């Protein structure tokens, strides 16, 4: 069905690889941009006010 | 050959019905007979592709109909523009 057996189909190419600008594994290899920092799409950094991750990285309050 | 009524549509066997089997058989029988060439006059013309007809002897290649080398409207246009 939809569970354990389809999990076996996980030896294809990965959706995301390591990103050259920020060091995370969030670079989408078919589209050519990063889902975390925006590298490949934006000269500027991706940063949203509803997100916590950059504040956590800088030990900031929300 | 050894069929009373069916022809080329004996490949169908029981299926798809009378009207359709009859029509396929007739169209294909008239198409697969060797036709007269318009350049050399011999009966050596066969269909290559839809609308394209070729003579085996002289090598002449011409455009025509889907399942026959000529069409009625084509004959009329030939007659009229031969007049003028």
């Amino acid at each position: 069905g939809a569970g354990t057996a389809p999990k076996g189909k996980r030896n294809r190419t990965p959706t995301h690889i390591r990103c050259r600008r920020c060091g995370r594994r969030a670079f989408n290899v078919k589209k050519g941009y990063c889902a975390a920092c925006g590298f490949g799409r934006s000269r500027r950094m991706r940063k949203y006010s509803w997100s916590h991750k950059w504040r956590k990285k800088r030990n900031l309050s929300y | 050959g050894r069929t009373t009524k069916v022809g080329s549509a004996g490949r169908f066997g029981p299926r798809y019905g009378l009207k359709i089997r009859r029509r396929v058989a007739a169209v294909e029988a008239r198409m697969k007979q060797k036709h007269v060439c318009p350049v050399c006059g011999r009966k050596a013309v066969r269909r290559i592709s839809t609308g394209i007809w070729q003579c085996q002897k002289c090598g002449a290649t011409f455009a025509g109909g889907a399942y026959l080398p000529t069409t009625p409207a084509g004959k009329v246009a030939k007659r009229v523009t031969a007049s003028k």
Binding site: - | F12, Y16, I20, R23, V24, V27, P38, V39, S49, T50, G51, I52, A60, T61, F62, A63, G64, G65, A66, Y67, L68, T70, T71, A73, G74, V76, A77, K78, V80, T81, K84
Partner: protein, 237 residues
């Protein structure tokens, strides 16, 4: 609600787009600004099947060296010479302006405005007939039966399009229709709207019936034009 197939086609996705990289190039005549008053001569060097066209095409080589595709007429031979221009004879395969074409002649590949390359009467087995000439307009009978006026300087080619009788033979099988549709990426197989759910179609619902007239106004909004759009009448005769 949810969307219709006719609304998803407008987005331009792969499910709906034509595979024209598979085809032979477009078919256009020669520009006026390079055939002004010259009456060019060419030779037919190949006749070819085209997957996007419904008619066979021919490859013509001209004197300079330029090769081009034309829509092929019933009867044209490999090794035959054709003429394009105003002082071209009246012979099957030649292209002339309408002002030089007698009444009663069978014609194909007619321009809408002069110089536009060819628009009208292109399909396998079609022909148009020249009806009337005047100094301001030429009236032609199109295959739909309709009479239409053209500018007398519009270009047309003489004869009938090749590839007629195509529909004389039944398709017979579903698989043959599969291949015929795949060749041009047509939506196949086609669903019925009365066996869809109500979220999917203005027909639709578990009792499988249209519960309102299937004739729909010309001014209805998109998502609602299904059935018989702006019908003058319905039925047998």
């Amino acid at each position: 609600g949810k969307s219709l197939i006719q609304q998803r086609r407008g987005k331009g996705t792969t499910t709906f787009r034509a595979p024209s990289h598979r085809y032979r190039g477009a078919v256009r005549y020669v520009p006026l600004n390079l055939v002004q008053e010259r009456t060019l001569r060419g030779v037919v060097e190949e006749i070819l099947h085209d997957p996007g066209r419904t008619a066979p095409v021919a490859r013509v080589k001209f004197e300079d060296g330029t090769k081009k595709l034309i829509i092929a007429p019933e009867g044209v031979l490999v090794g035959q010479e054709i003429y394009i221009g105003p002082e071209a004879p009246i012979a099957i395969g030649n292209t002339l302006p309408l002002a030089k074409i007698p009444e009663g002649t069978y014609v194909y590949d007619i321009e809408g405005v002069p110089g536009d390359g060819g628009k009208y009467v292109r399909a396998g087995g079609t022909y148009a007939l020249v009806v009337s000439r005047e100094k301001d307009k030429v009236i032609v009978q199109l295959p739909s039966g309709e009479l239409k006026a053209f500018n007398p300087m519009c270009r047309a080619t003489i004869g009938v399009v090749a590839g007629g009788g195509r529909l004389e033979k039944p398709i017979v099988k579903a698989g043959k229709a599969y291949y015929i549709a795949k060749a041009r990426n047509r939506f196949w197989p086609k669903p019925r709207g009365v066996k869809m759910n109500a979220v999917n179609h203005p027909h639709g619902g578990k009792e499988h019936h249209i519960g309102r007239p299937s004739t729909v106004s010309r001014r209805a909004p998109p998502g609602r034009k299904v059935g018989h759009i702006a019908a003058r009448r319905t039925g047998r005769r």
